[PDB]
Amino acid sequence: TLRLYDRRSIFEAVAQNNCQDLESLLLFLQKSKKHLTDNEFKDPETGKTCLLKAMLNLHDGQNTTIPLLLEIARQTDSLKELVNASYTDSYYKGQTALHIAIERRNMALVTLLVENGADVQAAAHGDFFKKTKGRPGFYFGELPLSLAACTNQLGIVKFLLQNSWQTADISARDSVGNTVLHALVEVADNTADNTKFVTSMYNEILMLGAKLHPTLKLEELTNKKGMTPLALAAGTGKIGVLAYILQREIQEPE
DSSP, X not given: OOOOOOHHHHHHHHHTTOSHHHHHHHHHHHHTXXXXXXXXXXXXXXXXXXXXXXXXXXXXXBOSHXXXXXXXXXXXXXXXXXXXXXXXXXXXXXXXXXXXXXXXXXXHHHHHXXXXXXXXXXXXXXXXXXXXXXXXXOOOOSSHHHHHHHTTOHHHHHHHHSOSSOXXXXXXXXXXXXXHHHHHHXXXXXXXXXXXXXXXXXXXXXXXXXXXXXXXXXXXXXXXXXXXXXXXXXXXXXXXXXXXXXXXXXXXXX
């Protein structure tokens, strides 16, 4: 009687990028005593929110849904819980909208998500981002820093490490025990182009680490197996990684 909307109409209007069906659900939610973080607005099997369905169904990397929904959550005071809403299924466990923004390789999206208070240390440790018998599932390091590093996004790494809202902890560790550097080691495949790419990524990561925090020696951080990055590169047979490791440890006596 007063423009009531259910979750399915919300997801539909989000997919087809229709905004007229959203300004009315704004007043609906404002008058229907419920917040957008309730269990009735998430996918009961995966926890997919309207923000996540907007991230999946993107149109040329742009959408008016996502800012409309950000402002609605801002007015609802549920902004922090929605901007950090993660999956609940055992497959995509721990995936947030920031990981999708890193995957789709959009700088403006990452900027808008970080500026709204997204969790920079969100861990995506689902069964998809792990190791198994075949097709491990494109393991990246379970961290947004590791994800931006292994996806060839240097500027995104710089923005994640030097944002004015929540600086990313470069010395952080994932659920497996791999740092950002151990993720760079694991992502190598001994071909030429990827070797040069991981070499440059390592160089820039080490430079930014020595600049932001000169006290932390990230090259001596061990995983849960007690293995240094050099030890990991030796055990996985990453020849070029060993070459660059030892070339950098020979040079720069400081």
